[PDB]
Design a binder for these strands. Structure first.
Ligand SMILES: [Zn+2]
Lengths: 198, 710, 48, 116
RNA sequence: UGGGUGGUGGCC
């Protein structure tokens, strides 16, 4: 059985390293200097190093030539224990969600309507904007007349208002966000959040 | 530094090539006068830069040729004219400063007094001065004796060929103290020492008589030849070249895992790291072996007592680094960084198949800000790795009194660390006669480690030794490679900048010819010093920078080459164009550095020490111009200093830089911090002739007062 | 570390993580360690 | 095989029949080679959506699939070279499962993930 | 906005 070793890789660029290695193997398999490595495994949450399965350090040192992702690991590689080969392949894991990016990060939001398109769903957000008074932010209720006085990119349709940032509002923001862009499990709004919305 | 060093550094950098590939070769640079801008390029006055907290710097333009070539015969050797690289700070009153060649009237109209010496940079509106640091001389063989370790003697020899990117790498050839007494070597980048004979056989000298021919130049003295037997019987296992290379490579910094790896690594480290100064050509064993043999021969000579040890305090063995070498040292790294950055920027585009624009590649910020930061802070190195670099190289100019300013512009520095109980580096060596002020020195924790030049002292700037080599080859010198080893003994060796180059048979005629040509100043410039030793048949020639030399008169037989005609022409030097340069041309005065001073006969004064009496020496070869010329700037204002106790002169030199006075003529314009000026300064009623050239009678500091001692 | 060994339990990254924790703890109460890197902040200076 | 190698890193999906990692378009443009003779999965986007789901964790690259223990443990030892997923959660449609059972294929999901 | 670093200098 070929052994498994750790090779230093750029943090976040491990996913394309396996693709590059596969392309290199395909390119060199018809040539006089093929890549003699058996397999390369990249875990889901392990960042900074990639597992490579081969027989001797010479084979990997020859094969990882020209790979800038493994430049730090080009010269020296560590030995992974034999008992960890099976452990390498182990992976573990009207509601409320919280956004992952943007200015609304880590905010309690309540689903308004579910679109059957399986792409985006509308949430109830607290407007985290300064009403175009500072920019040329804590959670607070939307003031329609304030932003109507401030002018700028603003549209009024009664209580349905449209303002800067492609945000749809009513009475409370009603904007659709990607299902992968929100976290549907692990929110649990508290009683203070309920009032705000053993 | 501006005219030569910058062009040499930019041209000797290897090109960068990176399937498509490119060249990007640089060529002749251009420079312009300092200019500030958005706005039209307008000349920047030094005074304006001083008030507005600007930086008196000049832009740098280089010519670049970009030749990118790919598969299918697609090469485009495009070139770009005058691409901006960075701003180089300019030193006042230089050739490239706006205050150059201007009349005193123009200077006054520009609010810059004509008395300002210049020689300082302006960084963010502060006047910075580059203190000259001293270092032990390079490319020379020195033998010392550390009697506190396993070695009884050590033949240290630095080596730097010419402005190498890697700093100087040392070579050690020592003797074990303890049979015993084994001669060994300490190669660079080798973690362990190695005996000498293995080193020689690694060069390929498998034969045994060749090694001893290289080391021993005369096979008639048994005590000399027997001393190699201890470290010759220690080496009879290794005979072939490959086994020697493997023996070396087994102890490398990163030893190979295969015999081929060890052999190639050791061969490369010998061909590149060891002794770059003798030559890094395709092959240099024929002279590297001779240089190692010379080191070993010197070590044996020291051991036998036929030649005394070298002195570290003697400034014939020291060099001074002025603004030139230090700026070049910074510029090497600040250009390597720029090359790395443009290479990275091109790489980030060629891999993705996209074309790169060279204008966006060049980061003027790195070079400009690196030079500015190093000048401003004095940490003489890169910002992130300054812990391995010197500090305090650049200090704020001390503009309190004129004498203080002058002294601060001519200040030396010993980089020996303070808080050291050693007194040898602090004592006043005999060699500091006419080169360094015997009196002026701080009395704090840095006593003896800070020095100031004498008044006549001059620092050599350096010159290429190619004409010297051409003249020697044209002359009757026999080159080193095509010489018979048996002929070494009955002849004199010839050195140039420490590089052994050939042998000569007649030393006296060669020395006379060199002296005559230098005095005529036709091929050998006046900066070159020729030293001939007689106890050991050697002739040494130096043309590098940093040597310290002073002018002296010439005595032919018992009279002076200076005659009434020269004085008469000098007295009319505002009518006649006859100047000091014309005096040097006629071979009347001759600059003499310390090593040449070692062998001259000096007369203190002609009208006294040259008359006919009971012959003391009667073989004078030079004469001092005036004995009082050996004092520094501050100690030359003391009246009757030869009548005072020695520490009093030092204290006066210390306190002569804290007396108030008119520190500069145009003091009402400068917005200086902590400016002191006296209402009614006066010139001394009793002066010395030396303070006429310090302009003391124009910017005095003090008042004549009726003093009663009661 | 306590959210990594909580779920991942990779049994290899845990060793490196506890090594880094040990190094940081040691540097917190002593910065001059033989054969160890200097704990420094991104300003060119080691920490006190 | 270059066609097995994904053309990008966008909306990758893992096969529930051989754990082969291909993009959503690759499952349509090129098709799953290890199951093309089984499902005829190439040629329609809807059945591509039904066959594979974008929810997966980890990527595995067998450079020598027939000389690796990871391939044996992931039940992809005899399968063709390509990028492989570690653990994928999902169930094949009942009609597809019955068709595969009638075509001499054993229903073995690649779900080795730990459910807390 | 304070901390840090370096340099110069005074008295022993
Ligand atoms: Zn499949």
């Amino acid at each position: 059985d070929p052994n498994l070793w750790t090779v230093k890789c750029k943090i976040g660029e491990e996913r394309a390293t396996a693709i590059s290695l596969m392309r290199k193997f395909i390119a060199y398999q018809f040539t006089d200097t093929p890549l003699q490595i058996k397999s390369v495994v990249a875990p889901e949450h392990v960042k900074g190093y990639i597992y490579v399965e081969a027989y001797k350090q010479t084979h990997v040192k020859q094969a990882i030539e020209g790979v800038g992702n493994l430049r730090l690991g080009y010269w020296n590689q560590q030995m992974v224990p034999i008992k960890e080969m099976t452990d390498v392949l182990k992976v573990v894991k009207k509601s409320w969600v919280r956004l992952k990016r943007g200015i609304y990060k880590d905010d309690i939001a309540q689903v308004d309507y579910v679109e059957p398109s399986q792409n985006t769903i509308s949430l109830k957000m607290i407007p985290r904007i300064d009403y175009d008074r500072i920019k040329a932010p804590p959670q607070r209720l939307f003031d329609a007349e304030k932003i109507r006085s401030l002018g700028g990119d603003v549209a009024s349709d009664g209580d349905f208002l449209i303002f800067e940032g492609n945000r749809y509002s009513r009475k409370f923001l009603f904007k659709s966000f990607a299902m992968s862009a929100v976290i549907t499990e692990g929110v649990k709004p508290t009683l203070s959040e309920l009032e705000k919305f053993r | 530094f501006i005219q030569m060093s910058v062009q040499r550094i930019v041209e000797d950098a290897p090109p960068i090539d990176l399937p498509p590939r490119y060249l990007l070769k640089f060529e002749q640079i251009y420079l312009s006068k300092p200019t500030h801008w958005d706005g039209a390029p307008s000349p920047m006055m030094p005074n304006e830069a001083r008030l507005r907290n600007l930086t008196y710097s000049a832009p740098l333009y280089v010519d670049i040729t970009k030749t990118v070539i790919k598969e299918g015969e697609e090469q485009l050797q495009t070139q770009h004219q005058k691409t901006f690289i960075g701003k180089i700070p300019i030193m006042l009153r230089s050739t490239y400063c706006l205050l150059n060649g201007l009349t005193d009237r123009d200077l006054c109209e520009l609010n810059e007094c004509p008395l300002d010496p210049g020689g300082y940079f302006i960084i963010n509106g502060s006047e910075k001065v580059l203190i000259a640091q001293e270092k032990m001389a390079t490319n020379t063989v020195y033998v010392f004796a550390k009697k506190d370790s396993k070695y009884a003697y050590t033949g240290e020899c630095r080596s730097c060929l010419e402005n190498s990117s890697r700093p100087t790498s040392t070579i050690w050839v020592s003797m074990l103290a303890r049979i015993g007494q084994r001669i060994v070597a300490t190669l660079p980048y080798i973690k362990q020492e190695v005996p000498i004979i293995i080193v020689f056989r690694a060069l390929g000298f498998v034969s045994d008589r060749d090694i001893l021919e290289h080391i021993i130049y005369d096979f008639e003295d048994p005590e000399m030849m027997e001393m190699v037997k201890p470290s010759l019987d220690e080496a009879f296992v290794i005979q072939e070249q490959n086994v020697a290379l493997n023996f070396i490579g087994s102890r490398g910094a990163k030893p190979g895992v295969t015999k081929e790896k060890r052999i190639k690594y050791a061969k490369e480290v010998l061909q590149k790291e060891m002794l770059p100064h003798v030559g890094v050509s395709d092959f240099c064993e024929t002279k590297k072996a001779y240089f190692l043999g010379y080191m070993v021969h010197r070590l044996l000579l020291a051991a036998l007592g036929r030649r005394e040890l070298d002195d570290r305090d003697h400034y014939g063995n020291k060099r001074l680094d002025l603004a030139g070498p230090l700026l070049a040292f910074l510029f090497r790294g600040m250009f390597k960084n720029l090359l790395k950055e443009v290479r990275i920027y091109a790489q980030k585009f060629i891999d993705r198949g996209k074309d790169f624009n060279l204008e966006l590649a060049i980061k003027t910020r790195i070079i400009s800000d690196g030079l500015k930061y190093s000048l401003a802070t004095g940490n003489w190195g890169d910002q992130k790795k300054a812990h391995q670099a010197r500090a305090g190289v650049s200090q704020v100019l001390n503009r309190l009194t004129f004498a203080s300013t002058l002294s601060h512009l001519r200040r030396l520095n010993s980089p020996i660390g303070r808080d050291g109980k050693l007194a040898k580096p602090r004592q006043l060596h005999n060699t500091l006669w006419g080169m360094v002020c015997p009196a002026e020195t701080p009395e704090g924790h840095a006593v003896g480690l800070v020095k100031n030049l004498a008044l006549m002292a001059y620092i050599s700037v350096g010159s290429q030794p190619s004409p010297i080599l051409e003249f020697l080859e044209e002359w009757s010198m026999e080159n080193l490679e095509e010489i018979s080893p048996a002929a070494i003994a009955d002849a004199t060796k010839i050195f140039v900048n420490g590089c052994w180059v050939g042998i000569h048979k007649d030393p006296e005629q060669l020395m006379n010819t060199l002296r005559k040509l230098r005095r005529q100043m036709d091929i050998i410039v006046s900066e070159v010093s020729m030293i001939r030793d007689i106890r050991e048949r050697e002739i040494r020639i130096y043309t590098d920078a940093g040597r310290i030399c002073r002018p002296l008169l010439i005595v032919e037989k018992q009279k002076l080459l200076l005659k009434k005609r020269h004085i008469d022409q000098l007295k009319e030097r505002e009518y006649n164009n006859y100047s000091w340069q014309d005096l040097v041309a006629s071979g009347v005065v001759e600059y003499i550095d310390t090593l040449e001073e070692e062998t001259v006969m000096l007369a203190m004064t002609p009208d006294d020490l040259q008359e006919k009496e009971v012959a003391y020496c009667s073989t004078y070869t030079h004469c001092e111009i005036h004995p009082s010329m050996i004092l520094g700037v501050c100690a030359s204002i003391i009246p009757f200093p030869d009548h005072n106790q020695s520490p009093r002169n030092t204290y006066q030199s210390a306190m002569g830089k804290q007396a108030m006075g008119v520190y500069i003529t145009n003091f009402h314009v400068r917005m200086d911090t902590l400016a002191h000026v006296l209402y009614y300064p006066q010139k001394p009623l009793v002066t010395t002739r030396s303070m006429e050239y310090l302009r003391f009678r124009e910017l005095p500091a003090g008042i004549n007062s009726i003093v009663a001692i009661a | 570390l306590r959210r990594n060994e909580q779920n991942g339990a990779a049994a290899h990254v845990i060793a490196e993580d506890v090594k880094l924790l040990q190094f940081h703890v040691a540097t917190m109460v002593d910065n001059e360690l033989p054969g160890l890197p200097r704990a420094m902040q991104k300003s060119g200076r080691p920490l006190k | 095989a270059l066609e097995t190698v994904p053309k990008d890193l966008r909306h990758l999906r893992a096969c529930l029949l051989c754990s082969l990692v291909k993009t959503i378009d690759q499952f349509e443009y090129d098709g799953c080679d290890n199951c093309d003779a089984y499902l005829q999965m190439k040629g329609n986007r809807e059945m591509v959506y039904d066959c594979t789901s974008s929810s997966f964790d980890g990527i595995i690259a067998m450079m020598s699939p027939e000389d690796s223990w990871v391939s044996k443990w992931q039940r992809v030892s005899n399968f063709k070279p390509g990028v492989y997923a570690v653990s994928v959660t999902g169930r094949l449609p009942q009609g597809i499962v019955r068709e595969l059972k009638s075509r001499g294929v054993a229903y073995k999901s690649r779900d080795t993930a730990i459910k807390t």
